[PDB]
Amino acid sequence: IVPTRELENVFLGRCKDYEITRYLDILPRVRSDCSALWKDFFKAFSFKNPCDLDLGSYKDFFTSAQQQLPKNKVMFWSGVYDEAHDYANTGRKYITLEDTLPGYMLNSLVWCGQRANPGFNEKVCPDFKTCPVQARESFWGMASSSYAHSAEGEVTYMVDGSNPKVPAYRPDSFFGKYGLPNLTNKVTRVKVIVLHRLGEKIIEKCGAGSLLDLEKLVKAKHFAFDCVENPRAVLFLLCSDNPNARECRLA
Amino acid sequence: IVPTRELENVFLGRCKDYEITRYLDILPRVRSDCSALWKDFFKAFSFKNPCDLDLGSYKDFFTSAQQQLPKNKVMFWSGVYDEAHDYANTGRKYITLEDTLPGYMLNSLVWCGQRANPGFNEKVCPDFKTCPVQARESFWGMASSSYAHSAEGEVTYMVDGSNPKVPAYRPDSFFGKYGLPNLTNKVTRVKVIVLHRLGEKIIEKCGAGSLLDLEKLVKAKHFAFDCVENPRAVLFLLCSDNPNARECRLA
Numbered sequence: 001i002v003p004t005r006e007l008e009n010v011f012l013g014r015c016k017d018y019e020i021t022r023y024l025d026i027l028p029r030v031r032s033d034c035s036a037l038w039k040d041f042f043k044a045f046s047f048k049n050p051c052d053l054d055l056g057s058y059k060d061f062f063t064s065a066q067q068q069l070p071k072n073k074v075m076f077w078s079g080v081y082d083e084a085h086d087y088a089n090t091g092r093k094y095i096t097l098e099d100t101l102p103g104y105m106l107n108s109l110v111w112c113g114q115r116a117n118p119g120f121n122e123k124v125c126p127d128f129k130t131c132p133v134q135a136r137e138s139f140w141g142m143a144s145s146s147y148a149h150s151a152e153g154e155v156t157y158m159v160d161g162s163n164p165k166v167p168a169y170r171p172d173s174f175f176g177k178y179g180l181p182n183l184t185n186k187v188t189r190v191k192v193i194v195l196h197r198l199g200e201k202i203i204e205k206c207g208a209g210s211l212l213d214l215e216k217l218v219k220a221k222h223f224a225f226d227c228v229e230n231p232r233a234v235l236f237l238l239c240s241d242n243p244n245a246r247e248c249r250l251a
Numbered sequence: 252i253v254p255t256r257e258l259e260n261v262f263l264g265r266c267k268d269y270e271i272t273r274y275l276d277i278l279p280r281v282r283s284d285c286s287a288l289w290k291d292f293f294k295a296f297s298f299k300n301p302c303d304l305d306l307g308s309y310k311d312f313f314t315s316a317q318q319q320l321p322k323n324k325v326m327f328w329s330g331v332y333d334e335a336h337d338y339a340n341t342g343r344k345y346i347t348l349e350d351t352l353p354g355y356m357l358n359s360l361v362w363c364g365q366r367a368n369p370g371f372n373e374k375v376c377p378d379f380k381t382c383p384v385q386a387r388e389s390f391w392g393m394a395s396s397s398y399a400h401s402a403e404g405e406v407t408y409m410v411d412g413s414n415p416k417v418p419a420y421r422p423d424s425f426f427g428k429y430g431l432p433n434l435t436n437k438v439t440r441v442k443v444i445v446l447h448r449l450g451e452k453i454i455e456k457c458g459a460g461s462l463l464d465l466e467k468l469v470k471a472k473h474f475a476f477d478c479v480e481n482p483r484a485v486l487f488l489l490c491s492d493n494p495n496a497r498e499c500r501l502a
C-alpha cells in the first residue's frame with residue numbers, strides 16, 4: 001500500500017488546524033503541543049519493521065492526545081461508517097472517534113515503520129493482512145480503547161442490520177474487542193441503532209440474534225440498554241439519498 | 252472582531268492538509284506550493300490599514316489558488332450555510348466555494364492588515380461593516396468571482412425562501428454581485444433550490460418576487476433556468492434534524 005506523502009507535515013498541519021479552529025465548542029483542547037504529539041506518535045512505529053507493533057505501541061501518544069468527551073454524546077459504530085458519521089453530523093449531534101484530535105489527525109492516512117533511516121517507509125507499506133492482528137489493529141484499536149474508556153453517560157452504537165454475511169454485533173469487531181469491554185462505570189446506558197439500508201432485506205432485529213447477545217452483555221455490565229431500528233431521524237437521512245424508495249413515501 | 256490566532260500556521264496547515272489529502276478525487280491540485288500561496292495571500296492585506304482593500308487586492312492569490320471545477324457540480328448559496336453544505340455533502344453531490352482550496356483555507360477565519368510591523372493585527376479587526384464595500388467584500392467577492400468564472404455546465408444555487416428580512420435573491424449578495432455576473436458561456440443552466448425552513452412562514456416562491464427577478468436575469472444570459480422548493484432530497488435532510496415537523500409526515 002502506498003503511504004501518505006509528507007506524513008509529518010500532514011500530521012502537524014491537521015493538528016494545528018484542529019487546535020485553533022475545529023470542534024471549538026464541542027471538544028476540549030489538548031495540553032500537548034503538536035510537536036510533542038508528533039514525537040509520541042512517531043516513536044510508536046519508527047525504526048521497527050512495519051509489522052512490529054502491538055496494542056501497547058501507541059499508548060503514550062493516546063495518553064497525550066486523549067480529550068475529555070462530552071457526556072451522552074459518544075457514538076460507536078460497526079459496518080455503517082458513512083451513515084453513522086452522517087448522522088453524528090460532525091460533532092453536532094454525536095461525537096465519533098474521527099472528530100477527536102487523534103482521530104482527525106490520522107483519519108485515512110497510511111504509514112509504517114522501517115529499521116533504516118529515516119525510520120519510516122516513504123515508498124511502500126505492507127498490505128494490512130500481512131501483519132499479525134495485534135499489529136494491524138495497534139493504532140486504531142488503541143485509539144478505540146482510549147476513546148471508549150473516556151466515554152460518559154449514554155453511549156450510542158450504530159450497527160448494520162441488513163448484512164446477511166456479518167452479524168450486527170460481533171465479539172471480534174472493533175466495538176466488541178475495544179469498545180464495549182472498555183466502557184467504564186461512568187457509562188449509564190448503551191443505545192443501539194439498527195440501520196436497515198433501503199431496498200435491502202432485513203437481517204437482524206432488536207431483541208434477537210447477535211443483538212440479543214449484545215443486550216445481555218450490556219445488562220451484565222449493569223448498563224441500561226435500548227435498541228431501535230431505523231428511527232425516524234435516521235430513516236430521513238437514508239431517504240435523502242434515495243427519496244423514491246418505498247420507505248420514504250410522504251403523506 | 253477577534254482575529255484568528257496563528258494565522259500563518261493555520262493557513263499553511265490547512266493548505267498542506269488539503270494538498271495531500273482533501274478532495275483528491277473531486278478537485279485538482281494547484282501548481283503553487285503552500286508557501287507561495289501564503290506569500291500571495293499575505294501581501295494582499297499586509298502593511299496597510301485594515302480597510303485599505305479593494306477587489307484587486309487578492310488577485311494574485313486567487314489566480315494562484317484557482318482550480319478547474321467539476322462540470323455540473325458547482326453550487327452557490329446565499330443565507331443557508333448549514334443546509335447548503337449538508338446537501339452538497341463535502342463535494343460528493345456538489346462542490347461549494349468552501350470545498351475549493353482558497354475557500355477551505357480561509358473558511359471562518361478572521362484577519363486584517365495594519366501598517367506597523369508585523370503588518371497584520373493580532374488583537375482586533377474591524378466589524379468590516381465598518382470598511383467601505385469594496386474592502387469588506389475584497390476577499391470573499393474575489394473568491395466568488397473567480398469560482399463563478401471557473402464554473403461549467405449546470406450550476407445550482409440554494410437560497411433562503413423563509414427570511415422576511417432578506418430576499419431569496421438580491422443583486423447585492425455575494426452571488427448577485429460576484430457570482431451570476433461572472434458565469435461564462437460554459438454554464439448551461441442555473442438550477443435554483445429554495446429552502447422553506449420547517450415550521451416557518453414561506454416568504455419567497457419560485458416564479459415570484461426576487462426569484463422571478465433572478466429567472467429573468469438568468470434567461471437574459473441565455474442560460475436555462477429551473478427552480479424547486481424543498482426538493483425531497485433536501486426536505487429529508489431538514490426532517491432528519493426535526494423529525495416531528497408537520498412537513499415530514501410519512502404516508
Ligand SMILES: O=c1c2ncn3c2ncn1[C@@H]1O[C@H](COP(=O)(O)OP(=O)(O)OC[C@H]2O[C@@H]3[C@H](O)[C@@H]2O)[C@@H](O)[C@H]1O
Pocket residue numbers: 097098107108109128136137140141143144173174
Ligand atoms: O478492522 C478495522 C476496524 N474496524 C473498525 N475500525 C477499524 N479500523 C481498522 N481496522 C483494521 O486495521 C487495518 C487498518 O485500518 P485502517 O485502514 O488504517 O483504518 P480505516 O481507515 O479502514 O478505518 C479506521 C476506522 O474504522 C474503525 C477504526 O476505529 C476507525 O475509526 C484495517 O485493514 C482494518 O482491518
